[PDB]
Structure formats: C-alpha cells, structure tokens
Amino acid sequence: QVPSTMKVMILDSGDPNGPLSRAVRNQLRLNGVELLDKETTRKDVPSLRLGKVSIAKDTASVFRNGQTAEYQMIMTVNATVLIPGRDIYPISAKVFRSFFDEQDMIVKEMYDRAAEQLIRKLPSIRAADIRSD
C-alpha cells in the first residue's frame, strides 16, 4: 500500500534509537521500504521527519452523585513528509487509551499504533503530489 515513489525513503528524527523512531522504522520495513541515511547521494528520495511527540495523561473526577474517576492517555505525533523539489506535507497521529486505572507497555503499544497511522497517510500524499501538475 505504500506508494511506489516512497519505497525508498529517509527517516529523519531527533532520536533514531527512541521508541517512536523504532516503531516507525519497523513499520516502514514491514511495508518493504528501504531506509537511507540522510546523507545519501541518491536523488529525489522523500523524507519522513518526526517533528514532535507528545504524551498527555488526564485524570478526571465526575460528580454523579457519588463520584467516578476516569484516566486517559493520549499520544500525539506530528510529522512531515518532504517530496524534494516539490512540497512538504504535515501529517499526524493520535492514539487514545481510557481506563479504570503496566503503564510502560501501554505506551510501547501506543507508539506502534502511532507509527501505523503515519504510514497509512502516505497514499494521500502521493495522490496530492500526482494532482499538483
């Protein structure tokens, strides 16, 4: 499903060995994407830049009467895909878990979901890129 124009790609991130980068790397490999270093001499290789990762925890107390407590975790990822010489495309992922409230394994799993959401945006970018002529 990854467009053919994106089967070779650069992954640009501030921490290539962090959990988000690994999760995105992992999904790109699973989809048959060859990842190049940023200093490649190849031409026109698109880049996926991981710009921002945010993790928010919300604790809410609701008066019913009697009270109820609810916990949310929200993971938001903002990234950009650059098609050299053409355009830059912002994409994002948002992953939501709510509870009854281990934490670290939940987050690990959220990163995989965030990575799948990003990769699923690539077709819409190629569609726009084709129509821009």
d(CA 52, CA 67) in angstroms, rounded, equals 36
Residues 6+ apart with CB under 8 A from 31: 1, 2, 119
Topology given in CATH for the domain delimited by 1-133: Double Stranded RNA Binding Domain (3.30.160)
Residue extents of the structural domains in the chain: 1-133
Resolution (A): 2.2
Nearest one of 121, 112, 116, 90 to 6, comparing CA atoms: 121
Q: How was this structure determined?
A: X-ray
Q: Which two tokens stand for residue 116?
A: 């799948």
Q: Cβ distance 38 to 13 under 8 Å? A: no
